[PDB]
Design a binder for this molecule. Structure first.
Ligand SMILES: Nc1nc2c(ncn2[C@@H]2O[C@H](COP(=O)(O)OP(=O)(O)O[C@H]3O[C@@H]([C@H](O)CO)[C@H](O)[C@@H](O)[C@@H]3O)[C@@H](O)[C@H]2O)c(=O)[nH]1
Ligand SMILES: Nc1nc2c(ncn2[C@@H]2O[C@H](COP(=O)(O)OP(=O)(O)O[C@H]3O[C@@H]([C@H](O)CO)[C@H](O)[C@@H](O)[C@@H]3O)[C@@H](O)[C@H]2O)c(=O)[nH]1
Lengths: 179, 179
C-alpha cells in the first residue's frame, strides 16, 4: 500500500513560505490523498500554535480574491477542485523581499499546499469554470475577520503580479484597495 | 460581517450521528464558510480524541465507495464539489439500530457535515459529473488503512439501501464484499 507522503521544500523566492506536495492513490474511481496530519505538518508552525480552523472558499471563473493578510494567522492553502493562480506576496515590511511574489498554479495536475506565515499577502485567481479553495488556519486567540486584516491592491504597481487578466471579478473590499 | 455559526442536530434514526450545517457568506464571487473549528466541533467527540487528519477524495460520476468503517476513527464528512448520495450505516453490533441506514444528499446547496463515531459504515455515490468529498478524522495512534478496516457490500440485502444505479464503479475491495 502507499504510505501518506509529503514532499516539503521552502520557496527559493520568499523565506518561510513552504511548498508541500502530497502523494495520491489513483484508480478507476479517481484519487484519495491526505492534505494534512498533525504528525507530519504541525511542524510548519511554531509550537503552541495549532491548526484549529478549516475553511472552503468556492469561487466562479475570473474571480480574484486578495491581496489579504493579518498579523496572527498561519495559512495552509490549496485548490481541491478546478484551477487557481495562487499568489503569495511578502508583506513583512522588515523583509529584504518585501512585495516580491511567487505564483503556484494549483490544479488536478499540480496538487501543492502552500504554507504562509503571518504578515504575508494571500491572493488567488480562478482560471477554471469554478474553484474550491481549501484553507487551514493556525492562530492564537480569535479569528482575524476582514476588519482586522490588511489589503493590498491585486494590481499594486509596486508588486507587479502577472495575472492572466486585467478584468477580474472583485469584492468592494478589493475594488476599494485599487483606490 | 457574519459570525461563524453551526446548526448541530442529532440524527432521528441513528443515535450519536450528528448533522452540522454551517452558515455561508455568499456574494458576487461565490461563497466562504467554515467546515471546522476546534472550539465548536471538538466537543462532539470524547476529551483527548483530536481531529488531526484531513483527506480529499475526488471521484467520477457513478463511483460508489463503501460500505467502510473501523473500530477507532471519528469522521466528519461532506461534499464540497458536485453532489453525492451519502449513506451512513449503523455497524455497531450491540446497537438496537444495527444495519439501519440514513441517506443525505450533500452539495454546496445542502452543506451538511455528518459526524460518525467509530464502528459505523460510511458510503457515498457520485450523482454529479465529478465530486470532491472532504473527510476529517479523529483517532488515537496510527491511521487504519483499508487492510485495518471492515467492509459491507454496498447492495447488502440485510441493509437494503436504495441506490440510484445497479452498476456503480467499484474498487476490487468493494466488488469482493458482494461475493
Ligand atoms: N458565515 C461566514 N462568513 C464569513 C466567514 N469568513 C468570512 N466571512 C464573512 O465574509 C465576508 C468577506 O470576508 P473576507 O475576508 O473579506 O473574504 P475574502 O474571501 O475576500 O478574503 C479572504 O481572502 C483570502 C485570500 O486573499 C484569497 O485566497 C485570505 O487568506 C483570507 O484571510 C481572507 O479572509 C465578511 O463579511 C466576513 O465576515 C465564514 O467562515 N463564515
Ligand atoms: N497516497 C495515499 N494513499 C491512500 C490514502 N488513503 C488511502 N490510500 C490508499 O488508497 C487505497 C484505497 O484505500 P481505501 O481505504 O480502500 O479507499 P476507499 O475510498 O475505497 O475507502 C474509504 O471509504 C470511505 C467511505 O466508505 C466512502 O466515503 C471510508 O469512510 C474510509 O475510511 C475509507 O478509507 C489503499 O491502497 C490505501 O492504502 C492517502 O491519504 N494517501
Amino acid at each position: 500500500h502507499m504510505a501518506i507522503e509529503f514532499d516539503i521544500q521552502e520557496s527559493k523566492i520568499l523565506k518561510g513560505v513552504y511548498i508541500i506536495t502530497p502523494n495520491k492513490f489513483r484508480d478507476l474511481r479517481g484519487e484519495i490523498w491526505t492534505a494534512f496530519t498533525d504528525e507530519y505538518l504541525s511542524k510548519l508552525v511554531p509550537d503552541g500554535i495549532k491548526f484549529k480552523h478549516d475553511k472552503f472558499i468556492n469561487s466562479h471563473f475570473n474571480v480574484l480574491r486578495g491581496i489579504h493578510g493579518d498579523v496572527k494567522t498561519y495559512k495552509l492553502v490549496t485548490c481541491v477542485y478546478g484551477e487557481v493562480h495562487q499568489v503569495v506576496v511578502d508583506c513583512r515590511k522588515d523583509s529584504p523581499t518585501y512585495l516580491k511574489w511567487e505564483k503556484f498554479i494549483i490544479s488536478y495536475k499540480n496538487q501543492q499546499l502552500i504554507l504562509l506565515p503571518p504578515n504575508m499577502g494571500n491572493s488567488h485567481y480562478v482560471s477554471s469554470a469554478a474553484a474550491v479553495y481549501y484553507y487551514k488556519l493556525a492562530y492564537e486567540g480569535e479569528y482575524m475577520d476582514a476588519p482586522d486584516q490588511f489589503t493590498y491592491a491585486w494590481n499594486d504597481e509596486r508588486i507587479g503580479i502577472d495575472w492572466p487578466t486585467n478584468t477580474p471579478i472583485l469584492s468592494d473590499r478589493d475594488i476599494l484597495a485599487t483606490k
